[PDB]
Tab-separated table of C-alpha atoms and ligand atoms in Angstrom:
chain	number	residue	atom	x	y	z
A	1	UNK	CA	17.841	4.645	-6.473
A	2	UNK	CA	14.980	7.179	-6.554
A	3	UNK	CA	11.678	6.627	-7.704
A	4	UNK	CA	8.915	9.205	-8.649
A	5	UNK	CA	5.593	9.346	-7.435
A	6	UNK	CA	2.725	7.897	-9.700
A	7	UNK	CA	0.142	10.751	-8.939
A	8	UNK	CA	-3.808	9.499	-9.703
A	9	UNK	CA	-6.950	12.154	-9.459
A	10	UNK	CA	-9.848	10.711	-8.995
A	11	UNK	CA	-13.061	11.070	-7.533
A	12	UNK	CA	-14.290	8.789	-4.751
A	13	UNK	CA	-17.482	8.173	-6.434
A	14	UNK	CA	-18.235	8.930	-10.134
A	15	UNK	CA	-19.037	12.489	-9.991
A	16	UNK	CA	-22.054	14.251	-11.374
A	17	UNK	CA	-22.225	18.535	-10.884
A	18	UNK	CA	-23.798	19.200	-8.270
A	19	UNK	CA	-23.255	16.139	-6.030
A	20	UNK	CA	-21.168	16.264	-3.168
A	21	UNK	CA	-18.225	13.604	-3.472
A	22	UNK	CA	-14.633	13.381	-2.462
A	23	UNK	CA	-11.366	14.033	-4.514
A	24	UNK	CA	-9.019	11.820	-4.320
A	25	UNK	CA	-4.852	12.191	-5.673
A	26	UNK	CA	-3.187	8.312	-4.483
A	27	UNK	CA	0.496	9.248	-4.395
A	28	UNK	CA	2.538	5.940	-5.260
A	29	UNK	CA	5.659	4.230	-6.497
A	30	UNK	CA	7.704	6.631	-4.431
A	31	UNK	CA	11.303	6.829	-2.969
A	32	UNK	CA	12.621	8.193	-0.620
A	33	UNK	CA	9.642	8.931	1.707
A	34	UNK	CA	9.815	12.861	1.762
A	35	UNK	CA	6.873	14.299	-0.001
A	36	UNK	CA	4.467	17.308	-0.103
A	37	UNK	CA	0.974	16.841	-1.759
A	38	UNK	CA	-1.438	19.838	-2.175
A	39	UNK	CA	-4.665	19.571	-4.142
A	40	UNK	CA	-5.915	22.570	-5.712
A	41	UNK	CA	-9.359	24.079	-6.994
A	42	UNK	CA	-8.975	26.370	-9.729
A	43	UNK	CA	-5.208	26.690	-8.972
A	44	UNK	CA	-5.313	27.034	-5.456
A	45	UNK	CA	-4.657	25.414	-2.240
A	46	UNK	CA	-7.238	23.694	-0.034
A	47	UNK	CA	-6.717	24.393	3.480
A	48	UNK	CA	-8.630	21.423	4.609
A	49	UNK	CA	-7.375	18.084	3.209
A	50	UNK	CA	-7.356	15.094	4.828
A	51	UNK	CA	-4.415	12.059	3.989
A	52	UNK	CA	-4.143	8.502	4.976
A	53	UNK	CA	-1.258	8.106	7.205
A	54	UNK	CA	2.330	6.986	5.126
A	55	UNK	CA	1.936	3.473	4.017
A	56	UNK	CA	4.562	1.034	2.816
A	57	UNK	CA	4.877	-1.467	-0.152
A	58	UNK	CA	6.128	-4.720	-0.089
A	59	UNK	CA	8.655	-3.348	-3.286
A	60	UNK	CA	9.351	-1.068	-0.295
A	61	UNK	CA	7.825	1.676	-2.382
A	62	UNK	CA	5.902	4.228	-0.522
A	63	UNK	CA	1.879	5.365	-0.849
A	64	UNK	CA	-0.564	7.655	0.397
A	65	UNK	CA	-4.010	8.903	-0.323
A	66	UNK	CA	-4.793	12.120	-0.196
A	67	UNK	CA	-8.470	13.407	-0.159
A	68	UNK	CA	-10.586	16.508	0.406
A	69	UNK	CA	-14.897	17.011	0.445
A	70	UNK	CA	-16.140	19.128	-2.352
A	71	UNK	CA	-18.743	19.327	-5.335
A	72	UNK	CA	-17.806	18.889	-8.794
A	73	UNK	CA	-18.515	22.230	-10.777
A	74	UNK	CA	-18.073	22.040	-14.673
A	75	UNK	CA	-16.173	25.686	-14.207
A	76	UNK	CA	-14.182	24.111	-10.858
A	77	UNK	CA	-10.713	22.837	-12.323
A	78	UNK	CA	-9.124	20.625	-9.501
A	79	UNK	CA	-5.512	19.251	-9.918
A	80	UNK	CA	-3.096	18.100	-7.569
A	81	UNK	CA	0.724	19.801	-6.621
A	82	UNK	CA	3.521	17.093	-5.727
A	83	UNK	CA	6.766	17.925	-4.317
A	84	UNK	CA	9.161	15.490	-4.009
A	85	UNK	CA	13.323	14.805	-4.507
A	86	UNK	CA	12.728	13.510	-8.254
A	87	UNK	CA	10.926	16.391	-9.035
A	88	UNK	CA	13.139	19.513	-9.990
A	89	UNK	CA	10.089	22.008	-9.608
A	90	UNK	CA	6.291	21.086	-8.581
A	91	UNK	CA	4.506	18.148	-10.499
A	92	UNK	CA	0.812	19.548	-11.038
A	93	UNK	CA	-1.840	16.849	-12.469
A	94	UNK	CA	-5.460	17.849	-13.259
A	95	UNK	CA	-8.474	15.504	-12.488
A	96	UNK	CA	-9.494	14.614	-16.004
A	97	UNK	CA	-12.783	14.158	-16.821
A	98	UNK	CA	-9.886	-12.811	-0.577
A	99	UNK	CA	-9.819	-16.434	1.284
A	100	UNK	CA	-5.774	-15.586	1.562
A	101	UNK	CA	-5.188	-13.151	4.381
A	102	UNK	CA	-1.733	-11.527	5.410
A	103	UNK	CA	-0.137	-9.917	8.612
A	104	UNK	CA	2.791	-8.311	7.961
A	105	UNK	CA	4.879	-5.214	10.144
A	106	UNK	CA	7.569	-2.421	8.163
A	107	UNK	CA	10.178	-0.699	9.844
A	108	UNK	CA	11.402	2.497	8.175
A	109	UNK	CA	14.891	4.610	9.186
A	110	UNK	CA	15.795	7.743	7.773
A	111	UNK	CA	18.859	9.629	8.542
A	112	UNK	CA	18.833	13.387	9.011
A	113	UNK	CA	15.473	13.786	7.950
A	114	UNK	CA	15.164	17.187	8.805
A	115	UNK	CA	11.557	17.547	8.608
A	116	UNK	CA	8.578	17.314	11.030
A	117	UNK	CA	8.683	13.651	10.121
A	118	UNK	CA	10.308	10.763	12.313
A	119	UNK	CA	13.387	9.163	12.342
A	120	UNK	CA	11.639	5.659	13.050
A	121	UNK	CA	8.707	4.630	12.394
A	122	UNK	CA	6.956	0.680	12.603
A	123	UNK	CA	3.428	0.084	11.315
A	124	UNK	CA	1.099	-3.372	11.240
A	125	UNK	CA	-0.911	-4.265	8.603
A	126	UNK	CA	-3.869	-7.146	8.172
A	127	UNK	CA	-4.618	-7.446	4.344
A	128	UNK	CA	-3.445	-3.690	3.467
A	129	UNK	CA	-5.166	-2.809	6.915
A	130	UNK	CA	-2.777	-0.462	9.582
A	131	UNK	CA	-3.765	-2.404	12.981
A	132	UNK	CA	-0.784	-1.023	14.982
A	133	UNK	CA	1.482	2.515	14.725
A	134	UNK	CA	4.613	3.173	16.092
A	135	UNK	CA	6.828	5.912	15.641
A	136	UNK	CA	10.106	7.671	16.746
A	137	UNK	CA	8.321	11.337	18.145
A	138	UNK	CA	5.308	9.173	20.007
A	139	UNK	CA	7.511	6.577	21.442
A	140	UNK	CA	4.631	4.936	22.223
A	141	UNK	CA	2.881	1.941	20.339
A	142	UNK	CA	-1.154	2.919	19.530
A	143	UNK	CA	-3.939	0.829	17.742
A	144	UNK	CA	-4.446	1.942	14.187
A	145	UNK	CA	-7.838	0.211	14.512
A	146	UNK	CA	-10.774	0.167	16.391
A	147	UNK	CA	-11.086	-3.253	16.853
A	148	UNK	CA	-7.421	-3.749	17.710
A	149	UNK	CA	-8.475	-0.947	20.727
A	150	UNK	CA	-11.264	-2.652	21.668
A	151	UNK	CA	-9.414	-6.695	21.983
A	152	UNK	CA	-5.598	-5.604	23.627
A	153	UNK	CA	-5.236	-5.297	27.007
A	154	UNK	CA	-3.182	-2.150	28.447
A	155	UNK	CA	-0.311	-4.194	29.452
A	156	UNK	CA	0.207	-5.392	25.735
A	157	UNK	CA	0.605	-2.182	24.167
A	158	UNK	CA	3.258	-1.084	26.939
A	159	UNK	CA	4.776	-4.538	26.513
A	160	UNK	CA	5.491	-4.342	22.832
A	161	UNK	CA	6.440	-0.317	23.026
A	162	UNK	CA	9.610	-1.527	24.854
A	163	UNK	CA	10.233	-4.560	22.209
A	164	UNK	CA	9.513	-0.804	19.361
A	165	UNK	CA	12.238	1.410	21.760
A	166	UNK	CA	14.852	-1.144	21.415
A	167	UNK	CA	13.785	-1.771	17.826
A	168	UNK	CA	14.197	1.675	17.168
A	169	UNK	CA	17.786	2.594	18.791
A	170	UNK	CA	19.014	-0.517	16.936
A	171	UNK	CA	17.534	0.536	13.371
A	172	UNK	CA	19.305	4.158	14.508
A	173	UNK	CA	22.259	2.514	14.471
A	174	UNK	CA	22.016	-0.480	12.298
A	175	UNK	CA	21.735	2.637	9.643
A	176	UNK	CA	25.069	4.728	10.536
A	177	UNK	CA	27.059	1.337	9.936
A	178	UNK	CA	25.503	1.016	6.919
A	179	UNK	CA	26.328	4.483	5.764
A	180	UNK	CA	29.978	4.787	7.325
A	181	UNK	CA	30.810	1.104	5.651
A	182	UNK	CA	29.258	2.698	1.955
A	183	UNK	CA	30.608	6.247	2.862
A	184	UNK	CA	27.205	7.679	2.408
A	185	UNK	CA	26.160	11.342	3.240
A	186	UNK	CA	22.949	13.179	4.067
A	187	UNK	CA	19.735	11.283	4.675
A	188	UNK	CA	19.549	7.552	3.844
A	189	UNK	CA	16.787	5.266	4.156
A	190	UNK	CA	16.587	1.856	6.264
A	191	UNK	CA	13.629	-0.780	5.191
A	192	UNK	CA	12.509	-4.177	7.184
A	193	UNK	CA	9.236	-6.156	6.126
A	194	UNK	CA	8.397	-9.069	8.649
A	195	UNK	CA	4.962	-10.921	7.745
A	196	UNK	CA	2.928	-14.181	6.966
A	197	UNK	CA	0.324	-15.731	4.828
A	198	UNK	CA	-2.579	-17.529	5.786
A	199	UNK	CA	-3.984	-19.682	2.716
A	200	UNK	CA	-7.413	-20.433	2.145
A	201	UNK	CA	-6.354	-24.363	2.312
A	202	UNK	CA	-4.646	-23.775	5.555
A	203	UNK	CA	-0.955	-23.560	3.861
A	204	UNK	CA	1.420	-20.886	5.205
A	205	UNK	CA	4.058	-18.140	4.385
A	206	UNK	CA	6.501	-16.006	5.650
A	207	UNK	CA	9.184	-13.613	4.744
A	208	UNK	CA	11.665	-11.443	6.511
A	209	UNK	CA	13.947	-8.565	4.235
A	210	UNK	CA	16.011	-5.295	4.942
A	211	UNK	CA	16.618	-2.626	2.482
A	212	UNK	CA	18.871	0.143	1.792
A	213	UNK	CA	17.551	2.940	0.132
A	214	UNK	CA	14.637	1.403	-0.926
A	215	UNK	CA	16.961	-1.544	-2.935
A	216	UNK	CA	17.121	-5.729	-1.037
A	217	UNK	CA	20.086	-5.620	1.364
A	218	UNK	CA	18.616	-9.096	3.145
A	219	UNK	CA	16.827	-11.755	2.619
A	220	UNK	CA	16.148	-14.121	5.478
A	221	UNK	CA	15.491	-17.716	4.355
A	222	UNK	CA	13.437	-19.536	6.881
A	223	UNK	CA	14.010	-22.938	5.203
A	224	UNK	CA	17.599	-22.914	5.377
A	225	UNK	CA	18.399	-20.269	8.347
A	226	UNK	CA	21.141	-18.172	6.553
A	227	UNK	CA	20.578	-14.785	5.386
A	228	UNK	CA	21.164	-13.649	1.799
A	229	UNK	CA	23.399	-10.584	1.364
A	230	UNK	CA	23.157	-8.708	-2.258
A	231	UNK	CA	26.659	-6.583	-1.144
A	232	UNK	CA	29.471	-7.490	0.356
A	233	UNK	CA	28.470	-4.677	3.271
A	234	UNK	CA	25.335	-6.702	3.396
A	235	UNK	CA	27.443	-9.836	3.864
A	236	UNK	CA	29.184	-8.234	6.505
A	237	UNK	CA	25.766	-7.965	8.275
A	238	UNK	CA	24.885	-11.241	7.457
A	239	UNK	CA	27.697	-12.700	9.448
A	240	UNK	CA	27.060	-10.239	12.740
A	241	UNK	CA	23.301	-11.700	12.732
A	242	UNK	CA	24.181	-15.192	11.660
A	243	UNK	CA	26.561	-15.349	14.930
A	244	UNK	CA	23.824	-15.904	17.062
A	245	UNK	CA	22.071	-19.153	16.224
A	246	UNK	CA	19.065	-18.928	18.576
A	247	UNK	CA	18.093	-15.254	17.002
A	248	UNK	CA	17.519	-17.077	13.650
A	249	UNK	CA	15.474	-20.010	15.233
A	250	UNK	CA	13.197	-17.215	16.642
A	251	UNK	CA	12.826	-16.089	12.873
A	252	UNK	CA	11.773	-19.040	11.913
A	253	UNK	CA	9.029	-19.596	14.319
A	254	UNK	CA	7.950	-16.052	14.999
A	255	UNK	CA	7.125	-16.478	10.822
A	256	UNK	CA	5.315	-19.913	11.047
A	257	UNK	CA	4.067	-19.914	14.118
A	258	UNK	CA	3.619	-16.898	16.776
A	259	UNK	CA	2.602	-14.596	13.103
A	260	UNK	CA	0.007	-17.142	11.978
A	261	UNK	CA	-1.665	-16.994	15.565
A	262	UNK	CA	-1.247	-13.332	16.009
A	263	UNK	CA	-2.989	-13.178	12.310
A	264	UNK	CA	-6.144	-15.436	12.878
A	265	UNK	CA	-6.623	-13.992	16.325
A	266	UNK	CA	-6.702	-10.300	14.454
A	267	UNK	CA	-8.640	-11.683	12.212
A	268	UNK	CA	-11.363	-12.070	14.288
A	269	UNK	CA	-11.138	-8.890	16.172
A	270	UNK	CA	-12.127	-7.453	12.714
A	271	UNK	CA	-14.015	-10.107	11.197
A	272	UNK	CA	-16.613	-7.662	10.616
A	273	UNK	CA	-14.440	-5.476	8.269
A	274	UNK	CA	-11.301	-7.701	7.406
A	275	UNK	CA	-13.958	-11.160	6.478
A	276	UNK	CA	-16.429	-8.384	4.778
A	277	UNK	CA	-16.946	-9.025	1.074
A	278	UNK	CA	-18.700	-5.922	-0.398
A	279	UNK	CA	-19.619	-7.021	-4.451
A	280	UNK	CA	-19.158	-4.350	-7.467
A	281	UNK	CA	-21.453	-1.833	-8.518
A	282	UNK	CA	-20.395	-2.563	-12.806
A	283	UNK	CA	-21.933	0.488	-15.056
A	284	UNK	CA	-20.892	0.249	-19.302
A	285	UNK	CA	-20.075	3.785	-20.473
A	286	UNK	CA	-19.693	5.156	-23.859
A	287	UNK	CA	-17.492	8.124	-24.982
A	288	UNK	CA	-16.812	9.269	-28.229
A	289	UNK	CA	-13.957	11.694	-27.446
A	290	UNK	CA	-13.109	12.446	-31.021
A	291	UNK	CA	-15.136	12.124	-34.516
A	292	UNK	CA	-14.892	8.587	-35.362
A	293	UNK	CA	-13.578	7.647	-32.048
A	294	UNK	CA	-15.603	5.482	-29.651
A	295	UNK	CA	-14.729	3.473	-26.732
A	296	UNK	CA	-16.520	1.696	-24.240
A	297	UNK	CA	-15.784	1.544	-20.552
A	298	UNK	CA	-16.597	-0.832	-17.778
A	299	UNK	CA	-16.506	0.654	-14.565
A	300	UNK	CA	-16.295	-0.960	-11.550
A	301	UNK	CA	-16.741	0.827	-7.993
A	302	UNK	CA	-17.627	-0.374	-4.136
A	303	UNK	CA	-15.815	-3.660	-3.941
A	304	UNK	CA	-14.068	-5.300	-1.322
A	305	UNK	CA	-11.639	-6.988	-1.168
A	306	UNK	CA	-9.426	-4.580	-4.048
A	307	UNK	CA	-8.969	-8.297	-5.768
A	308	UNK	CA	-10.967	-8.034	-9.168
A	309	UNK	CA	-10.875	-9.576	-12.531
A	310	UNK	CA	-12.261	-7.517	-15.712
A	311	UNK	CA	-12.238	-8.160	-19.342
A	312	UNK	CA	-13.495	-7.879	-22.899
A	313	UNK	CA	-15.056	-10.107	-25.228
A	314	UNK	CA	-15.842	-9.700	-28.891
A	315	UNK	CA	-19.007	-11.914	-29.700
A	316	UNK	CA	-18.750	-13.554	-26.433
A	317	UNK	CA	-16.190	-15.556	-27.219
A	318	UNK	CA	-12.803	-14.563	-27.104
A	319	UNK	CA	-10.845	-12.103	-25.762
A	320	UNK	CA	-9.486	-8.810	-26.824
A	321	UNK	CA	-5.948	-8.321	-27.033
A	322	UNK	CA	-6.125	-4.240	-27.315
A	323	UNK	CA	-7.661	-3.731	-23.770
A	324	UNK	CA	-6.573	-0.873	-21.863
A	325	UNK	CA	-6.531	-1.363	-18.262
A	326	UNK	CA	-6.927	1.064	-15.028
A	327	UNK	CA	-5.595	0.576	-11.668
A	328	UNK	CA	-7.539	-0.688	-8.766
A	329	UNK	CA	-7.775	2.463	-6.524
A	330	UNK	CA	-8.718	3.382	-2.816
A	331	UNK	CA	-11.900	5.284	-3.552
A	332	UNK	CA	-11.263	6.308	0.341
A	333	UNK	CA	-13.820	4.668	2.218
A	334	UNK	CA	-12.550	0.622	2.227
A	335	UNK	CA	-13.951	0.153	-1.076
A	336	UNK	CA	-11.359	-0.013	-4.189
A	337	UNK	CA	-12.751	1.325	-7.900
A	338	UNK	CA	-10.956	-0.336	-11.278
A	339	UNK	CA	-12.074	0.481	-15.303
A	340	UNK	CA	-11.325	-1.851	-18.529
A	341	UNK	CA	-12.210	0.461	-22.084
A	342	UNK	CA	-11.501	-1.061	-25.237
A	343	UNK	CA	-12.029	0.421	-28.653
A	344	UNK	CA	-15.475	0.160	-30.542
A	345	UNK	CA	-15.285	-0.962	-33.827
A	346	UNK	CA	-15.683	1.112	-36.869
A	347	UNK	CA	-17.164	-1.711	-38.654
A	348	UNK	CA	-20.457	-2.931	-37.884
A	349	UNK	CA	-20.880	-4.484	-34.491
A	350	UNK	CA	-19.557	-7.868	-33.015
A	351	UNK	CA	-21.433	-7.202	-29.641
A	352	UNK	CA	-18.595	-6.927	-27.260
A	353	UNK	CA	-19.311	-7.965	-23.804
A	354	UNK	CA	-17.643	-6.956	-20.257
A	355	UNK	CA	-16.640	-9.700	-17.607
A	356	UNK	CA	-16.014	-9.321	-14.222
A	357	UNK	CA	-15.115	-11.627	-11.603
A	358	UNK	CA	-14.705	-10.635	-8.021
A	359	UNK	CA	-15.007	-13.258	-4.958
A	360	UNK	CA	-16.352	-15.923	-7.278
A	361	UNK	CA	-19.554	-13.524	-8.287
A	362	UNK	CA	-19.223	-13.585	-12.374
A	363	UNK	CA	-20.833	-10.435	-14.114
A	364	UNK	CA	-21.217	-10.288	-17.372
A	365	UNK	CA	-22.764	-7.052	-18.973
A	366	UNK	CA	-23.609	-7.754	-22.392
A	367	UNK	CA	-24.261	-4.431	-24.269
B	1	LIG	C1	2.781	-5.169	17.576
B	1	LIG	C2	3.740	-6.343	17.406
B	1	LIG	C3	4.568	-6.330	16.394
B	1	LIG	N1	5.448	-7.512	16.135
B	1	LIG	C4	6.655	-7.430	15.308
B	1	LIG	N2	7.369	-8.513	15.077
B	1	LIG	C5	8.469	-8.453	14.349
B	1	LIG	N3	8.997	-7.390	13.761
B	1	LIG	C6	8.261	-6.312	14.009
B	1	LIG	N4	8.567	-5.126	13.546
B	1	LIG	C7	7.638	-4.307	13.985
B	1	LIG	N5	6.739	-4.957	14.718
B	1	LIG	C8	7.102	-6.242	14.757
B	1	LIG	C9	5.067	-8.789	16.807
B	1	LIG	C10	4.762	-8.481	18.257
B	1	LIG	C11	3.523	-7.600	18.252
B	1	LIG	C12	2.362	-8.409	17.677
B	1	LIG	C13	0.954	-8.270	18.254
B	1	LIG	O1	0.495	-7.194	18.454
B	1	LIG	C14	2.582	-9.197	16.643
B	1	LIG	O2	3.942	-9.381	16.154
């Protein structure tokens, strides 16, 4: 099943002419993982843009960022060209107008990929940040992070790139079974997702799941030590891996156990960025796009972590049930930006009022 890329323009910080800033076109929602993302000014290419490297979703959905350095001009029309499988010809889109911490590691296969991109690749991730990269043409396991660089002794990173070249040869051929027992052709995907959850109350979580072409194949359940099979090709997985008794035992404390540790320790090597809580910047716009159309907007920029709450009151006292809602998005540099407009009355005023709750700070911006 193929998925098309949700393709956002946006600026990293709201843009004034004149002011230098950085555009921004978060490429999301996507399978499989081939792409090509261009960002244009006035219709053409930019040769220097800069991308985050290719990130993975726990709906095993890819996403990327994609941004370039430039100064809004009100003549300067900036879009952004996406190429991808779902996409018969070029999609262009113009730029318009914490307590719970996770570690959690993705494996991705793709078969005949015939591209500059790898067969294999294996990234780490503390709370949506890459600690650790692997992949197929490095063959070598590298710190994502600074602090990870800075904490890890040499012998652990050539330690764990054998554990990543075994990985790898059996995800290489974990993935022709697959597609010899389904009599599949050309270039097919292979998804794992191994993590855990640290609670703010000290309570823990794991989970462990494989994917073909981007759909569950397994689910490992911890609890009872059996692995859940959607197909009957996935069943006939299940019972290869089930053989081996002391391979799920591992599972389960790998998840509860060796992950948690591995998770608090990281947690430390980045305290300074993974334990930093940076509050919102709120600013209440008006825009009256149309005659007799006016809508206010509360904008919310420079917060960290991307977990916010916004909303709308009429009066101050209840809630709006018309609000439209914008996405929490990577403004590029660890901060996340997010928006809540609602329309203005045409009647005379009830005084609506914006809420916003983020890390237990409550803002309220009565206008
Ligand atoms: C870098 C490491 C990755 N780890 C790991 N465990 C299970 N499945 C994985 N898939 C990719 N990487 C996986 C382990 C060992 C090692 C580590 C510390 O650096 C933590 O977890």
């Amino acid at each position: 099943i193929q998925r098309t890329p949700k393709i956002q323009v946006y600026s990293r910080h709201p843009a004034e002419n004149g002011k230098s800033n950085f555009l921004n076109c978060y490429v999301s929602g996507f399978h499989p993982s081939d792409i090509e993302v261009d960002l244009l000014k006035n219709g053409e290419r930019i040769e220097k843009v800069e991308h985050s490297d290719l990130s993975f979703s726990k709906d095993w959905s890819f996403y990327l960022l994609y941004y370039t350095e430039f100064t809004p001009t009100e003549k300067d029309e900036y879009a952004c060209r996406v190429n991808h499988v779902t996409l018969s010809q070029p999609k262009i889109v113009k730029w318009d107008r914490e307590r719970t911490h996770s570690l959690r590691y993705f494996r991705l296969g793709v078969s005949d990929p015939i591209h500059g991109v790898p067969e294999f690749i294996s990234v780490g991730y503390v709370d949506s940040h890459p600690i650790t990269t692997y992949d197929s043409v490095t063959r070598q396991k590298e710190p994502r992070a600074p602090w990870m660089a800075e904490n890890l002794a040499p012998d652990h990173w050539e330690r764990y790139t054998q554990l990543l070249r075994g990985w790898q040869q059996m995800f290489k051929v974990e993935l022709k079974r697959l597609q010899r027992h389904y009599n599949h052709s050309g270039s097919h995907t292979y998804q794992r997702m191994i993590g855990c959850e640290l609670l703010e109350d000290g309570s823990t979580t794991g989970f462990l799941q494989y994917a073909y072409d981007g759909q569950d194949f397994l689910i490992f359940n911890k609890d009872t030590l059996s692995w859940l099979a959607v197909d009957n090709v996935a069943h006939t997985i299940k019972q290869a891996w089930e053989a081996n008794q002391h391979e799920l035992l591992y599972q389960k404390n790998w998840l509860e156990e060796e992950c948690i540790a591995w998770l608090k320790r990281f947690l430390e090597y980045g305290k300074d960025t993974l334990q930093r809580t940076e509050p919102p910047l709120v600013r209440v716009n008006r825009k009256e796009t149309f005659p007799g159309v006016t809508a206010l907007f509360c904008k919310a920029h420079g917060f960290y972590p991307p977990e916010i709450y916004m909303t709308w009151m009429k009066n101050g006292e209840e809630i709006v049930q018309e609000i439209d809602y914008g996405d929490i998005l990577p403004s590029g540099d660890g901060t996340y930006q997010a928006w809540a407009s609602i329309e203005l009355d045409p009647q005379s005023s009830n005084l609506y009022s914006c809420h916003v709750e983020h890390c237990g700070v409550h803002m309220v911006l009565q206008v």
